[PDB]
Design a protein around this ligand. Structure first.
Ligand code: CLA
Ligand code: CLA
Ligand code: CLA
Ligand code: CLA
Ligand code: CLA
Ligand code: CLA
Ligand code: CLA
Ligand code: LHG
Ligand code: ZEX
Ligand code: ECH
Ligand code: BCR
Ligand code: SF4
Ligand code: CA
Ligand code: CL
Lengths: 75, 729, 31, 75, 40, 141, 75, 139, 80
């Protein structure tokens, strides 16, 4: 929460380069990204008989039933 | 430990509570160790000297920051399109965006825009230069020096005075009503006719040319010889430009009942006429009580002389009741100050008297909200100190069968009837509001229940305003009060019938519904405060409450449970209802003034009758510029108000912690934290001097209430200032 | 016109006097 | 759980849900504002609470107006 | 930060004095005082 | 009188809205009879009807009739409850009939409340309505 | 056993409201033109506005519990 | 001196802190006919020895809660426990039961302290005792 | 320490003494009631202020009254 407070104060003070964000001081969830990557390379390497991934939220392509979205990679 | 010096019971306390209670009981002078009444009064007198010096240093600082870092003369040139500057910002935390955003109002440095009305007040009193502000700031510095030395000297031996002059009520009240009230009013009327009107009609009246200038062509002599109507020869015309000689009159005491067309403030000459008349009445009322010669009244005799058939002792021994109780005196003073602060708020928005303050919408909103908040605080304090009087100072034998003990006698009737009328008001206001909301939501807003405020519109009609067709009293052209000459009447009719002022605004059923909501809030806050004051001494659940004092946590879970049974707790409960009522009134005032100032009164007239209109068209709509004070695309000058808005939300919710969670959970949690510190290597070298404990039950309620109130105030102040300065300022 | 640097420093030198007097009053009120 | 479901609602409207073009591009519901607005409390207040409450408060006179009424009623 | 007003070095010196030096000195003196086991 | 408002049939916002008043019930004429009923009221500039509670007899339907009907019904409810509480006080367990309600005597009083203000003034004049201050329990004053 | 009876009463009411006062017929032939609606509300006191147009000449509250999708998944 | 075997206990975090060696601790001694398990007032279970048992606790209330458990939660009721206060200088002050008889039963030689010869409602007014430093119940 | 006072409406039911978890109260012989015993508080320095004795008291407007006063390590119930 103090990271949120830091960000509110630095944005209010006109210091966006001092915030915690992707365009600033980065806090990348690298372990969750690595696990998402491993789930993306699962179907064929560590899950050989599995055709597609367990969920496209881990990584893949966007299912576009009708004009609407159903699931995409949640970055 | 030593601290607190004044409480050995708290000084022996080995916990952190000591420090907290040493903070909270420092100004409860009576409960200090070894306190007599004499030293109590002398210490209070010195603290009053210190407080007066603090107020004067606050004013000197206001003057110094207007003079040093403000734009006062630039605002003098154009006081309708230049924002006043409070002081300069020196914050090393600012980025380039905030530096550019707060470099506003023509400044070359980051500044804050003043909203206290300060520039309009020093324009209306004839100050035009920063050098005068600096000279006055140095003058208030040396005046505060004199008051601080006076306090120190009157704490010395051979200058510490007795107990007799403190209880000398007649001489002190004559002195305050004459020398402090009437003489000061006379001196301010002298300042008005000597500076304010001759600076409105452009001229320089400084201290150098103070000796030789007549305010009027015919001088003091027609004041002495006879009729003063010479001072009503020619008022300022309706083409007058403030601060110049164009359209200028020479008369210094007239009346036409209304506003000067340019500044849209009260006529300065009319203000002077009022002030001289009020000073004369204050001089007259100041010769009403006895002195060292023996012609005036003694207040005890008048109090003892008033009785009645069905009232018992009447007003017997209330002189010694009020004169020996500082809490009764405080209650009366706080109640009077709160009522007149509410009067100040309700008059200055509707009858402004400062030059061009009526076009400064955010300033007017800030002033009205500030004074109504101060009034709510003072009224709650009045009822709280009346409860403290009943706990500590009330003598049931000396006050037997008078009005005080009779109010004690039928206290159940008062509390039950207040409860009934609060239930009445709340039931029917909520029923009408919810009915309106439901039938508006069902696509059919014509089955709403809408009552015209007919009595309030008739009160509007019987003052000059003719927009309703009642045609009675001053609206009626042929009525007796209308045909009296009385040259305030046509100007007053023009001021109350032109719809460009806040003077007697037109009202619909939304005004009526929110007035009954305001009535409910006033009645319920009074019910809580009155029940607390009248059960401070005892109730059927706790008849020895006066032995436990004003403030104590409870009487335990026994006898069914007794949480929040003290009168302090009723003060604490009534704080919430006072804030609720003040929020309701400020919401109504701000939404009406946003409708009036922008010209779109139809939004209030068709949406205030149901609560979704209040939710959407007032709260949701007017936050949009506030919450965009900072965003991912940048900042503007409302960045500080967005941050303070969020800060107030946080402080309010932090108060919810102490209000909802209670002590014993926290005491057990702190016990585990104490264990953790006592077993951690390299931190066992560090020991606390006071044992960490949880906050007390009363401390928990007080701390949660303080956060609740601070968050309430800061949130609404941020919203009010940001919405009005984004829409208009 | 604006004030001078010497005006501001003279005001602070003046403000040294109520500072000392407030110290004296608070010390006397403490006992 | 209020924070969990607020995170879910904002992330699904910002980076998942929306309308797919026939060319293969997706226009999201709140146009990807979660990466820059959900790092501040003010962004949560303005872009999530204030912005998305416009549907529940401008529901009166329609079939969604009951959701307006409960929006008052819970309050 | 800068100022066009007279003696603009005075906020430069006094904002850290009123923000850091004065409160640290005041809380240090007050912490030494409120824990003084002198007499009572 | 009431110059700031207008009769509804003259206020053109009222006609422009009452041309399209929605039918609340399954009757298609419901909006039309709503318009016919609301045309005789006093409408504001927005077109919605406004009610006057000053005490005008022509505005008796605005305040006077539903208020006196509510007073009659509220007196019926209060007198039925009060007479039930007076009657069940002289029993072995008056708390039991307060929590498991004796149906027939309650029904006998329910079809007995059509003469309530005469009974109220009779009980007031016979001393059966108001007790003394010394008779009732009081908190320590 | 009493709790299981209560849950069975609730589920029976859900199936009854999905069969008599619903548009499962009509939604099933055309999924993405018609939203699910399984509650029909009487016209009284103006509350018939809540019977909104959901598709195929139906007037009722758009149900969001997902009963139609599970019923389609069960055949 | 204080005699008794310590009850066999695995140790717990709820026991004595630095107040025990700094300000005071408390001791409870009791005789037990058999070896059975009791509940520690600081959390957990301990086993009391056959014969004399001496337990050290942080507060008097913990010792008295243990004594209440001894009198009420055992089929042979242990009614002979003694509770003492132990100072870091080594002086042991006997606390409970002070006269050898449990305080719910009367005993001659007990002096009435904290007893008031007036009723609860005849305490005097606070306004009668202003600037005296004493409460209505202390006069 | 807190103050525990016993007033003359005491009827010697010993319930306040049984309810007290810190051994503040005893029962001493008396003559004002049929039980011929009155509660006493010799050990108010061990009183924590829990008011269990007040909860146990059956006389209307209780014959035992606890007044919270000066706070000590014993009175705040501190094990540290
Ligand atoms: C990290 C957050 C942060 C911090 C620390 C500051 C710090 C500061 N800001 Mg600031 N600001 C911030 C964020 C922050 N800002 C943001 C996000 C915005 C929005 C863009 C602003 C907008 C802003 C403006 C517009 C202004 C400041 C100003 C100031 C300065 C005030 C100093 C002062 O007058 O005396 C110190 C503070 C006080 C006297 C306040 C007293 C309040 C406390 C609670 C009273 C406690 C009393 C109590 C009895 C305690 C005992 C006393 C103690 C001595 C022992 C200070 C340097 C002002 C400035 O430049 O000063 C001239 C100013 O005008 N700020
Ligand atoms: C005539 C001589 C005189 C004068 C001028 C004063 C003046 C004062 N005495 Mg004092 N006193 C006197 C004789 C006098 N005394 C004598 C003879 C005795 C012996 C009996 C006392 C005994 C005495 C005691 C025991 C105490 C005082 C106190 C005070 C101070 C009151 C606080 C204050 O400033 O309120 C000023 C209030 C006003 C100027 C007006 C009140 C409110 C008005 C009516 C409403 C507002 C007006 C207007 C609409 C608002 C304008 C807005 C503005 C921004 C432009 C004040 C300085 C108290 C004090 O503070 O001690 C230092 C105190 O405790 N006096
Ligand atoms: C002229 C006005 C006046 C005067 C002389 C007094 C004087 C007194 N009052 Mg009183 N009172 C007043 C107004 C006044 N009050 C008002 C307006 C209210 C209603 C709110 C009260 C409510 C009240 C109660 C309920 C009680 C008193 C008590 C007392 C006595 C002891 C005060 C004490 O030690 O408090 C100690 C003072 C403090 C601990 C200060 C806390 C207040 C802080 C400064 C406010 C918070 C500021 C905020 C956090 C700043 C941060 C903001 C930033 C983050 C932006 C004393 C006789 C008490 C007493 O002894 O009664 C028996 C008591 O119980 N008064
Ligand atoms: C929105 C919040 C809210 C509401 C509605 C109330 C309502 C009330 N408070 Mg209150 N209060 C609140 C917040 C609130 N309080 C807070 C935050 C505090 C601070 C702790 C207090 C502190 C407080 C005190 C200290 C006192 C009150 C009193 C009152 C009563 C005044 C009578 C009245 O206004 O009209 C009547 C009531 C209403 C308008 C509200 C109830 C109406 C309902 C909605 C009707 C429908 C009921 C429904 C059919 C029930 C069926 C339930 C079913 C669905 C299961 C009333 C019950 C006073 C009192 O008791 O006076 C008699 C009193 O002394 N309150
Ligand atoms: C009480 C009124 C008051 C207030 C609220 C302020 C507020 C402020 N002053 Mg300021 N000032 C004042 C009086 C006041 N001044 C007076 C009377 C003088 C002498 C003429 C000055 C001289 C002054 C200078 C030279 C500077 C400020 C600055 C500032 C800002 C930062 C704080 C600082 O560094 O202070 C420093 C203040 C001083 C060194 C002078 C002491 C102030 C007075 C004499 C003490 C008042 C004490 C108070 C009344 C006691 C009660 C307080 C309460 C908490 C109990 C801030 C906006 C700085 C600024 O402009 O930042 C942009 C700056 O450089 N002030
Ligand atoms: C209201 C007063 C105030 C003021 C003026 C400041 C000012 C500052 N804060 Mg700050 N801050 C404040 C209150 C304040 N803060 C509060 C109330 C909070 C939160 C509760 C914060 C939280 C905060 C954070 C989290 C951070 C800052 C930082 C900074 C600095 C940014 C630039 C820098 O790198 O400094 C570097 C300069 C200093 C830290 C101090 C320099 C002092 C001198 C030059 C060194 C010592 C000299 C000598 C040995 C002693 C002189 C003796 C005698 C003459 C007196 C800036 C000086 C940042 C920071 O400290 O960066 C390092 C930072 O990360 N602030
Ligand atoms: C437990 C779940 C549940 C819930 C929430 C509802 C809810 C509802 N039912 Mg329903 N119903 C249920 C179970 C349930 N039912 C079951 C198990 C059956 C089979 C016996 C029915 C058979 C049924 C019929 C036949 C009708 C409803 C109707 C209704 C609606 C009005 C209720 C009414 O007439 O009040 C009556 C209140 C009392 C008798 C008291 C309402 C939405 C009516 C409706 O939707 O109108 C079109 C309607 O006609 N229900
Ligand atoms: C619209 C304002 C808000 C309304 C709220 C208040 C409703 C009115 C309350 C009246 C019930 C109490 C009547 C007192 C019961 C009573 O009989 O008192 C006795 C009193 C006769 O005694 P005297 O007035 O002679 O005694 C007062 C002094 O003379 C004693 O020295 O009768 C009246 O004065 C009645 C006048 C109403 C009193 C003023 C009411 C408040 C007005 C302000
Ligand atoms: C009678 C009754 C009871 C007993 C009730 C009591 C005890 C009533 C007590 C009453 C007192 C003591 C005083 C009454 C004051 C009553 C008043 C003042 C007037 C209310 C206003 C009335 C008519 C006039 C209202 C304006 C006048 C006029 C009618 C306008 O168009 C409208 C309007 C609102 C301006 C119950 C409650 C016990 C039980 C019930 O079943 C029976
Ligand atoms: C020889 C003599 C007389 C002639 C005297 C002459 C020729 C002049 C006398 C003037 C006198 C006697 C008093 C003047 C007093 C002015 C005072 C005391 C000012 C007080 C101001 C205060 C306190 C604060 C003001 C503020 C300032 C600084 C601001 O800037 C903003 C507003 C505010 C904050 C209000 C007369 C014939 C009479 C009588 C016979 C003897
Ligand atoms: C608790 C207590 C207390 C307190 C109380 C209080 C706080 C109260 C308040 C009260 C109030 C708060 C009141 C008020 C009131 C007011 C009034 C009552 C007014 C009146 C007015 C009038 C009557 C006027 C008239 C008019 C008009 C309207 C218009 C026209 C003209 C004329 C002017 C005629 C004391 C301390 C005492 C005691 C102890 C206890
Ligand atoms: S308050 Fe608690 S510890 Fe004190 S005497 Fe009563 S029961 Fe015993
Ligand atoms: Ca000049
Ligand atoms: Cl943001």
């Amino acid at each position: 929460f103090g990271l949120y407070i830091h960000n509110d104060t630095m944005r209010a003070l006109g210091r966006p380069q001092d915030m915690f964000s992707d365009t600033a001081i980065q806090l990348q969830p690298i372990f969750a990204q690595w696990v998402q990557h491993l789930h993306t390379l699962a179907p064929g390497a560590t899950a050989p008989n599995a055709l597609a991934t367990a969920s496209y939220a881990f990584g893949g392509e966007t299912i576009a039933v009708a004009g609407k979205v159903a699931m995409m990679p949640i970055t | 430990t030593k601290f607190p010096k004044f409480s050995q019971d708290l000084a022996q306390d080995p916990t952190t509570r000591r420090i907290w209670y040493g903070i909270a009981t420092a100004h409860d002078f009576e409960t200090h160790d070894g306190m007599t009444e004499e030293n109590l009064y002398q210490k209070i007198f010195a603290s009053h000297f210190g407080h007066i010096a603090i107020i004067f240093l606050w004013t000197s600082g206001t003057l110094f920051h207007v003079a040093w870092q403000g734009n006062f003369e630039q605002w003098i040139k154009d006081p309708l399109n230049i924002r006043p500057i409070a002081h300069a910002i020196w914050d090393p935390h600012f980025g380039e965006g905030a530096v550019n955003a707060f470099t506003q109002a023509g400044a070359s440095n980051p500044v804050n825009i003043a909203y206290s009305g300060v520039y309009h007040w020093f324009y209306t009193i004839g100050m035009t230069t920063n050098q005068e502000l600096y000279s006055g700031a140095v003058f208030l510095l040396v005046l505060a020096s004199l008051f601080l030395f006076a306090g120190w000297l009157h704490l010395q031996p051979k200058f510490r005075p007795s107990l007799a002059w403190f209880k000398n009520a007649e001489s002190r009240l004559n002195h305050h009503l004459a020398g402090l009230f009437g003489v000061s009013s006379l001196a301010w009327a002298g300042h008005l006719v000597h500076v304010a009107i001759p600076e409105a009609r452009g001229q320089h009246v400084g201290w150098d040319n103070f000796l030789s200038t007549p305010p009027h062509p015919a001088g003091l002599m027609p004041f002495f010889t006879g009729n003063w109507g010479v001072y009503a020869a020619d008022p300022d015309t309706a083409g007058h430009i403030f601060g110049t000689s164009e359209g200028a009159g020479t008369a210094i005491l007239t009346f036409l009942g209304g506003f000067h067309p340019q500044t849209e403030s009260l006529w300065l000459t009319d203000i002077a006429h009022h002030h001289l008349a009020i000073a004369v009445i204050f001089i007259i009322a100041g010769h009403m009580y006895r002195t060292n010669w023996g012609i005036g009244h003694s207040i005890k005799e008048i109090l003892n002389a008033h009785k009645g058939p069905l009232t018992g002792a009447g007003h017997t021994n209330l002189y010694d009741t009020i004169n020996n109780s500082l809490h009764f005196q405080l209650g009366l003073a706080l109640a009077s100050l709160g009522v007149i602060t509410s009067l100040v708020a309700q008059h200055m928005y509707s009858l402004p008297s400062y030059a061009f303050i009526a076009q400064d919408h955010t300033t007017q909103a800030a002033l009205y909200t500030h004074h109504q908040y101060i009034a709510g605080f003072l009224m709650v304090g009045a009822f709280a100190h009346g409860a403290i009087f009943f706990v500590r100072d009330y003598d049931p034998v000396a006050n037997k069968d008078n009005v005080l003990a009779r109010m004690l006698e039928h206290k159940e009737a008062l509390i039950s009837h207040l409860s009934w009328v609060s239930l009445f008001l709340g039931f029917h206001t909520l029923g009408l509001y919810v009915h309106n909301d439901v039938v508006v939501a069902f696509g059919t807003p014509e089955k709403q229940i809408l009552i015209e405020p007919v009595f309030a519109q008739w009160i509007q009609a019987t003052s000059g305003k003719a927009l309703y067709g009642f045609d009675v009293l001053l609206s009626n052209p042929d009525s007796i009060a209308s045909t009296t000459g009385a040259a305030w009447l046509p100007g007053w009719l023009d001021a109350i019938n032109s719809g460009t002022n806040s003077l007697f605004l037109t009202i619909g059923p939304g005004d009526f519904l929110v007035h009954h909501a305001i009535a409910l809030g006033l009645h319920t806050t009074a019910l809580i405060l009155i029940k607390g004051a009248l059960d401070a001494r005892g109730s059927k659940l706790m008849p020895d409450k006066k032995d436990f004092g004003y403030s104590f946590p409870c009487d335990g879970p026994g006898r069914g449970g007794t949480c929040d049974i003290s009168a302090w707790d009723a003060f604490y409960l009534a704080m919430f209802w006072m804030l609720n009522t003040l929020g309701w009134l400020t919401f109504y005032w701000h939404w009406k003034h946003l409708g009036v100032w922008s010209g779109n009164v139809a939004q209030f007239n068709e949406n205030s009758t149901y609560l979704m209109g209040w939710f959407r068209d007032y709260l949701w709509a007017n936050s949009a510029q506030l919450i965009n004070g900072y965003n991912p695309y940048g900042v503007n000058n409302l960045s500080v108000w967005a941050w303070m808005f969020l800060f107030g939300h946080l402080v309010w919710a932090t108060g919810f912690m102490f209000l909802i969670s209670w002590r014993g959970y926290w005491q057990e949690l702190i016990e585990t934290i104490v264990w953790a510190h006592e077993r951690t290597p390299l931190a066992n070298l560090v020991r606390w001097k006071d044992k960490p404990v949880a906050l007390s039950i009363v401390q928990a309620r007080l701390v949660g209430l303080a956060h609740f109130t601070v968050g309430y105030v800061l949130t609404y102040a941020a919203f009010l200032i940001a919405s009005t300065a984004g829409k208009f300022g | 016109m604006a004030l001078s640097d010497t005006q501001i420093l003279a005001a602070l030198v003046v403000a040294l006097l109520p500072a000392f007097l407030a110290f004296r009053l608070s010390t006397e009120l403490y006992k | 759980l209020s924070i969990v479901i607020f995170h879910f609602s904002w992330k699904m409207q910002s980076d998942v849900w929306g309308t797919v073009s026939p060319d293969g591009s997706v226009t999201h519901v709140t146009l990807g504002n979660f990466a820059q607005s959900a790092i501040t409390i003010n962004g949560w207040l303005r872009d999530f609470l204030w912005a998305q409450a416009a549907n529940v408060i401008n529901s009166y006179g329609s079939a969604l107006s009951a959701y307006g009424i409960m929006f008052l009623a819970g309050h | 930060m800068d100022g066009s007003y007279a003696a603009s070095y005075l906020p430069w010196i006094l904002i850290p004095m009123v923000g850091w030096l004065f409160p640290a000195v005041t809380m240090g003196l007050l912490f030494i005082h409120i824990e003084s086991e002198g007499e009572g | 009188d009431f110059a700031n408002l207008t009769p509804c049939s003259e206020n053109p916002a009222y006609l422009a809205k009452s041309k399209n008043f929605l039918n609340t019930t399954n009757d298609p004429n419901s909006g039309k009879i709503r318009a016919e009923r609301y045309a005789s009221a006093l409408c504001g500039p927005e077109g919605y009807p406004h009610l006057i509670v000053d005490g005008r007899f022509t505005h008796a339907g605005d305040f006077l009739i539903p208020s006196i009907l509510f007073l009659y019904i509220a007196g019926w409810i209060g007198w039925v409850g009060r007479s039930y509480l007076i009657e069940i006080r002289e029993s072995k367990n008056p708390e039991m009939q307060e929590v498991v309600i004796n149906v027939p005597l309650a029904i006998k009083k329910m079809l007995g409340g059509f003469l309530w203000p005469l009974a109220a003034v009779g009980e007031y004049t016979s001393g059966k309505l108001v007790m003394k201050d010394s008779e009732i329990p009081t908190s320590p004053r | 056993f009493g709790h299981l009876a209560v849950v069975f009463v609730w589920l029976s009411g859900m199936y009854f409201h999905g069969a008599k006062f619903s548009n499962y017929e009509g939604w099933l032939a055309d999924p993405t033109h018609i939203k699910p609606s399984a509650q029909v509300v009487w016209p009284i006191v103006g509350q018939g506005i809540l019977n909104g147009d959901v598709g195929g000449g139906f007037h009722g509250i758009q149900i969001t519990s997902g009963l139609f999708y599970l019923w389609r998944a069960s055949g | 001196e204080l005699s008794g075997q310590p009850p066999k206990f695995g140790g717990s975090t709820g026991g004595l802190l630095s107040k025990a060696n700094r300000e005071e601790k408390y001791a409870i001694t009791w005789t037990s006919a058999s070896e059975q398990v009791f509940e520690m007032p600081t959390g957990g279970a301990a086993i009391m020895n056959e014969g004399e048992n001496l337990l050290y606790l942080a507060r008097k209330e913990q010792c008295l809660a243990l004594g209440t458990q001894l009198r009420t939660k055992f089929k042979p009721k242990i009614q002979d426990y003694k509770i003492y206060r132990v100072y870091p200088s080594g002086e042991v002050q006997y606390l409970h039961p002070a006269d050898g008889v449990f305080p719910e039963k009367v005993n001659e030689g007990r002096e009435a302290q904290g007893t008031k010869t007036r009723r609860i409602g005849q305490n005097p007014e606070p306004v009668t005792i202003k600037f005296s430093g004493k409460a209505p119940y202390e006069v | 320490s807190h103050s525990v006072k016993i007033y003359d409406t005491c009827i010697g039911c010993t319930q306040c003494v049984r309810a007290c978890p810190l051994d503040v109260l005893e029962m001493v012989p008396w003559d004002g009631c049929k039980a011929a015993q009155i509660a006493s508080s010799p050990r108010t320095e061990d009183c924590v202020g829990c008011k269990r004795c007040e909860t146990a008291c059956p006389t209307d407007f209780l014959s035992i009254r606890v007044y919270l006063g000066a706070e000590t390590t014993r009175s705040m119930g501190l094990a540290y």
